[PDB]
Design an enzyme around this catalytic site. Structure first.
Site, PDB file in Angstrom:
ATOM      1  N   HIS B  79       0.828  -1.200   0.000  1.00  0.00           N
ATOM      2  CA  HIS B  79       0.000   0.000   0.000  1.00  0.00           C
ATOM      3  C   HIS B  79       0.866   1.255   0.000  1.00  0.00           C
ATOM      4  CE1 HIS B  79       0.003  -1.029   4.492  1.00  0.00           C
ATOM      5  NE2 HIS B  79       0.719   0.077   4.406  1.00  0.00           N
ATOM      6  N   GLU B  95       6.608  -7.711   3.363  1.00  0.00           N
ATOM      7  CA  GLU B  95       7.794  -8.562   3.296  1.00  0.00           C
ATOM      8  C   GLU B  95       7.445 -10.050   3.329  1.00  0.00           C
ATOM      9  OE1 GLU B  95      11.545  -7.491   3.037  1.00  0.00           O
ATOM     10  OE2 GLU B  95      10.867  -9.357   2.102  1.00  0.00           O
ATOM     11  N   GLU B  97       5.354 -11.356   1.537  1.00  0.00           N
ATOM     12  CA  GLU B  97       5.280 -11.668   0.116  1.00  0.00           C
ATOM     13  C   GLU B  97       6.661 -12.032  -0.433  1.00  0.00           C
ATOM     14  OE1 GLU B  97       1.963 -10.315   0.932  1.00  0.00           O
ATOM     15  OE2 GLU B  97       2.027 -12.308   0.005  1.00  0.00           O
ATOM     16  N   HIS B 114       2.214   0.700  -9.421  1.00  0.00           N
ATOM     17  CA  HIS B 114       0.881   0.980  -8.895  1.00  0.00           C
ATOM     18  C   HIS B 114       0.943   1.858  -7.642  1.00  0.00           C
ATOM     19  CE1 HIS B 114      -3.360   0.069  -7.709  1.00  0.00           C
ATOM     20  NE2 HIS B 114      -2.839   0.167  -6.499  1.00  0.00           N
ATOM     21  N   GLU B 115       1.708   1.423  -6.641  1.00  0.00           N
ATOM     22  CA  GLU B 115       1.782   2.128  -5.358  1.00  0.00           C
ATOM     23  C   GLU B 115       2.377   3.536  -5.471  1.00  0.00           C
ATOM     24  OE1 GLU B 115      -0.049   0.884  -3.169  1.00  0.00           O
ATOM     25  OE2 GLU B 115      -0.148  -1.174  -3.902  1.00  0.00           O
ATOM     26  N   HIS B 118      -0.192   6.015  -6.443  1.00  0.00           N
ATOM     27  CA  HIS B 118      -0.849   6.580  -5.269  1.00  0.00           C
ATOM     28  C   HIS B 118      -0.005   7.697  -4.663  1.00  0.00           C
ATOM     29  CE1 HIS B 118      -4.246   3.943  -5.143  1.00  0.00           C
ATOM     30  NE2 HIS B 118      -3.539   2.850  -4.921  1.00  0.00           N
ATOM     31  N   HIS B 124      -7.761   4.385  -7.425  1.00  0.00           N
ATOM     32  CA  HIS B 124      -7.867   3.123  -8.147  1.00  0.00           C
ATOM     33  C   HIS B 124      -8.671   3.252  -9.436  1.00  0.00           C
ATOM     34  CE1 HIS B 124      -6.952   0.617  -4.301  1.00  0.00           C
ATOM     35  NE2 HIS B 124      -5.864   0.779  -5.029  1.00  0.00           N
TER      36      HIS B 124
HETATM   37 CA   LIG Z   1       0.161  -9.731   2.484  1.00  0.00          CA
HETATM   38 CA   LIG Z   2       9.718 -12.014   1.514  1.00  0.00          CA
HETATM   39 ZN   LIG Z   3      -3.860   0.656  -4.723  1.00  0.00          ZN
HETATM   40 ZN   LIG Z   4       2.080   0.616   5.720  1.00  0.00          ZN
END
Ligand SMILES: [Ca+2]
Ligand SMILES: [Ca+2]
Ligand SMILES: [Zn+2]
Ligand SMILES: [Zn+2]
Ligand SMILES: [Ca+2]
Lengths: 124, 161
Positions: B79, B95, B97, B114-115, B118, B124
């Protein structure tokens, strides 16, 4: 915010409350904590109801105010539409994000609508 | 008036690096993400390694002190915050991920693009093939869809060229 949209199966086990509800009106926003809440008219509960911890209301679903930080922004014209809310219980309030499984009830397939009835509980 | 950077020349910093990728691949993912946005605007970006920057980039897990905790592997991947002082503009990546520079699930560059959108003040998109679409999508090359271009140009304007 980036989300991998959850399959109804895995969202059922992860969430604390997988209720059926209708969104009443425009989101109420607290511009000091940057959170937002939707007043919900709850109809049916599929998980809940067991209640561990907790927990409660439920006629308010909470979400961050800002879309970028995963605030759920409701996309619905009609106000009487039923939605499947699958969210987490934080403190005593039901919380939701862009990544939470929120979908209108009628748009779900037969397997999905039968899934929340009593099928996904087996998959947990 | 809607959250936008008053200056056109912006600074960024990678606070900490993910162990998923070599330092160079992280630097490349971030730089090329910023490049997509600077290509169509008069916007400029400069990487710093010391002190505070406009856009702070970090890899974090669970509760990381910003009032929006991560959710472990899956779900929320990353985000960011709209333009503003302090936390404004910052982008956070989960992290838990596994981050990649290829087809393997969860391409850092794709998500960062993408982020950072923002970070510059975009919402979006509902367009399935748009970079600003909230769901993770990857089809090899990541490029701005017309919706992305029109969105960012409606804020900062066209490129100089
Ligand atoms: Ca996650
Ligand atoms: Ca990781
Ligand atoms: Zn977004
Ligand atoms: Zn955050
Ligand atoms: Ca900042």
């Amino acid at each position: 915010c980036t989300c991998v949209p959850p399959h109804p199966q895995t969202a059922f086990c992860n969430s604390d409350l997988v209720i059926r509800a209708k969104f009443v009106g425009t989101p109420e926003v607290n511009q000091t904590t940057l959170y937002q809440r939707y007043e919900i008219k709850m109809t049916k509960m599929y998980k809940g109801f067991q209640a561990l911890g907790d927990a409660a209301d439920i006629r308010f679903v909470y979400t961050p105010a800002m879309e970028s930080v995963c605030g759920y922004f409701h996309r619905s014209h009609n106000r009487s539409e039923e939605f499947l809310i699958a969210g987490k219980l934080q403190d005593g309030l039901l919380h939701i994000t862009t990544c939470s499984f929120v979908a209108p009830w009628n748009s779900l397939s037969l397997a999905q609508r039968r899934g929340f009835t009593k099928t996904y509980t087996v998959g947990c | 008036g809607n959250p936008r950077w008053e200056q056109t020349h912006l600074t960024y910093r990678i606070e900490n690096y993910t162990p998923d990728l070599p330092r160079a691949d992280v630097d490349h993912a971030i730089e090329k993400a910023f490049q997509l946005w600077s290509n169509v605007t008069p916007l400029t970006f400069t990487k710093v390694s010391e002190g505070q920057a406009d856009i702070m980039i970090s890899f974090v897990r669970g509760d990381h002190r910003d009032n929006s905790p991560f959710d472990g592997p899956g779900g929320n991947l990353a985000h960011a915050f709209q333009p503003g002082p302090g936390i404004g503009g910052d982008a956070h990546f989960d992290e838990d991920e596994r981050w990649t520079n290829n087809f393997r699930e969860y391409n850092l560059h794709r998500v960062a693009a993408h982020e950072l959108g923002h970070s510059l003040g975009l919402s979006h998109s509902t367009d399935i093939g748009a970079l600003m679409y909230p769901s993770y999508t990857f089809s090899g090359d990541v490029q701005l869809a017309q919706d992305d271009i029109d969105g960012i140009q409606a804020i900062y304007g066209r490129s100089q060229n």
